[PDB]
Amino acid sequence: SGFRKMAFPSGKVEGCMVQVTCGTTTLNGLWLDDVVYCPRHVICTSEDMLNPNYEDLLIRKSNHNFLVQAGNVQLRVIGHSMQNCVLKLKVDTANPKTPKYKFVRIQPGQTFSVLACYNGSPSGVYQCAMRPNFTIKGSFLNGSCGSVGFNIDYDCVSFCYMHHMELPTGVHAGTDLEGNFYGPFVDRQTAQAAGTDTTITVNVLAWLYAAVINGDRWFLNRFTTTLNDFNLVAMKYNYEPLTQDHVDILGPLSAQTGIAVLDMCASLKELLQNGMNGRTILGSALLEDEFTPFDVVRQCS
Amino acid sequence: SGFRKMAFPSGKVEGCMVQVTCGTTTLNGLWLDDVVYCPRHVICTSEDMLNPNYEDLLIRKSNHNFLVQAGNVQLRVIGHSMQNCVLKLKVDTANPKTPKYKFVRIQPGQTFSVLACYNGSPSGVYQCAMRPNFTIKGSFLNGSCGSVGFNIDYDCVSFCYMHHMELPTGVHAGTDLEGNFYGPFVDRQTAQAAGTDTTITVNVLAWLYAAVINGDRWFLNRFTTTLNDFNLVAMKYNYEPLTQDHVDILGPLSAQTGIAVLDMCASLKELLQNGMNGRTILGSALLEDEFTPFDVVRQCSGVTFQ
Ligand SMILES: CNC(=O)c1cc(Br)cc([N+](=O)[O-])c1N[C@@H]1CCCC[C@@H]1NC(=O)c1cncc2ccccc12
Ligand SMILES: CNC(=O)c1cc(Br)cc([N+](=O)[O-])c1N[C@@H]1CCCC[C@@H]1NC(=O)c1cncc2ccccc12
């Protein structure tokens, strides 16, 4: 028992972290097989960032203009290309520590583990959720670009995020590993306000099921609601509307606990309307929305 | 910016995790050089657990009763011994992925990362604190015994915890890597109770400094308090007494923020008495006590590891 914010073991990703330097600009890269992936803004100077022409900036660089270092050892570049917002550097050798991997584009509300790196060396590993406004509330400092987010399934690493920037509100924005940004953000130094965020309804429901599994059941009530009646309450408290696909994804947790999803929604409605009255759920005084149903299943059997 | 419950990179420890099977029992072992360390209760049947005599039960086993697998490679056991509550199995082959390591016994309130493993496979990593009652509030299922907790200094892994059991109240208990339990617990299926816990004060102060570093300042005030006056309020709300040593280790965070420790203590005193008035600190409606001053510095300055 117990329920913790748990990241995947980072070893398989650590073996892929390199340093990428173009001019004086240096950030982290992801070395998989014979390709190194990193944010394309490594080819920009600070003044370039205000209004970059990435296609022009790329021709004025060359294979020799890229300095890739794997553990203080330099790698040699044999090719350069740009796919959306990621730079791809073909190198001399396939990484011998390349894990079984895929590139995936996650949906908002899905979670993943981030390996925060600086100069190609890891600082820490933590769990994040792709927020409905396509930011993530990460922990990143200057030099962290190129750090990646990932999930690990039975020995295959699914890379889903590469870090590009911190917005003025302190949240983070990035691309998938094909270089397409999550959300409407762009790799330019310009006003880009993230839209207002919302609470991930299905994740909050997943976490309440985790609480019931761990013995917290004071919030269960005898009432029920419909999907439409619940969604009227959700919009009032800035919760994502609940869909039938979300109900189905909670099916495993509803079956293990015997609590129907729309019954749990009735419990959630009361929690939104009345608060918690000085109680906690899984040690939290607030409703937690960065655990997916699959995150709950993994820890809660 | 941002502040997360952040674990160490686990790769170095992942390379040491093996599976240990004795009879119908399988749990995790830690393979360092040519030795595998694991909970000694792997030699017990369920009936043995009610009142085991480990010295007798170990005399009754042999090298061949132990099946050790590192991934898909079987390792052959050439010796078995017991050091307190840990079993030590000498194997023919040294782990080529053995990192620089030490075995340390941590103090209550200190933090570490747990690499949750099952059948020798790492499943997840998270940060936890050694609670003042010498339990940890972990996330563990059946088969997790032998999972280890650790810290990393540059390239050296300091192992400090090996998981042995879940108490009936749902918290977790274990040993250092010399086999000595943290707390008054024993590896026996018998009535056992953890003592009453307290809040780790120096960690709450560290976390408040992390909040200021991240721009949360609404809880700051113009007052300062004395050590004694604070401790009078702290002990009344089940907080650990604040010591001069705790003030000194908070020094870097105090200097980086320009907020004196006893100045922050005035904020903590008001927070303990009055709550947050519907506000949050680093996204939490409660005071967090599982970040040490060193954890805060490591995360907010970008300390890295091999
Ligand atoms: C801060 N400002 C922006 O992050 C930013 C904002 C916008 Br709008 C657009 C871009 N853009 O287009 O690349 C940005 N990235 C910067 C531009 C050049 C390359 C990388 C730069 N950022 C980091 O190094 C960085 C990453 N993570 C957390 C941080 C925390 C503190 C300081 C810096 C970071
Ligand atoms: C649950 N019960 C106890 O864990 C327990 C309780 C007491 Br009282 C004493 C011991 N003791 O003496 O070892 C215990 N360990 C068990 C006995 C034999 C060896 C390993 C056993 N535990 C696990 O497999 C385990 C570990 N962590 C979380 C779990 C969650 C659910 C189920 C099992 C676990």
Curated annotation (Swiss-Prot), chain A:
Q: Which reaction is recorded as catalysed by this protein?
A: TSAVLQ-|-SGFRK-NH2 and SGVTFQ-|-GKFKK the two peptides corresponding to the two self-cleavage sites of the SARS 3C-like proteinase are the two most reactive peptide substrates. The enzyme exhibits a strong preference for substrates containing Gln at P1 position and Leu at P2 position
- Cytoplasmic compartment spans: 1-301
Q: How is its activity regulated?
A: Inhibited by pyridone-containing alpha-ketoamides compounds 13a and 13b. In turn, alpha-ketoamide 13b (tert-butyl (1-((S)-1-(((S)-4-(benzylamino)-3,4-dioxo-1-((S)-2-oxopyrrolidin-3-yl)butan-2-yl)amino)-3-cyclopropyl-1-oxopropan-2-yl)-2-oxo-1,2-dihydropyridin-3-yl)carbamate) inhibits SARS-CoV-2 replication in human lung cells. Inhibited ex vivo by michael acceptor inhibitor N3. Inhibited ex vivo by compound 11a and 11b.
Indicate the cross-link positions, Glycyl lysine isopeptide (Lys-Gly) (interchain with G-Cter in ubiquitin): 5, 90
Subcellular location(s) of the protein:
Host cytoplasm; Host Golgi apparatus; Host nucleus
The Peptidase C30 domain is annotated at 1-301
Name the consequence of residue 189 to A: Does not affect ability to cleave and inactivate human TRMT1
Q: Which residues form the active site?
A: 41, 145
Q: Explain the purpose of this protein.
A: Cleaves the C-terminus of replicase polyprotein at 11 sites. Recognizes substrates containing the core sequence [ILMVF]-Q-|-[SGACN]. Cleaves and inactivates human TRMT1, preventing tRNA guanine(26)-dimethylation of tRNAs. May cleave human NLRP1 in lung epithelial cells, thereby activating the NLRP1 inflammasome pathway. May cleave human GSDMD, triggering alternative GSDME-mediated epithelial cell death upon activation of the NLRP1 inflammasome, which may enhance the release interleukins 1B, 6, 16 and 18. Also able to bind an ADP-ribose-1''-phosphate (ADRP).
Q: How does it assemble?
A: 3CL-PRO exists as monomer and homodimer. Only the homodimer shows catalytic activity. Interacts with host FBXO22; this interaction promotes the proteasomal degradation of nsp5.
Full protein name: 3C-like proteinase nsp5
The shown range, given as first to last of full length, is 3264 to 3564 of 4405
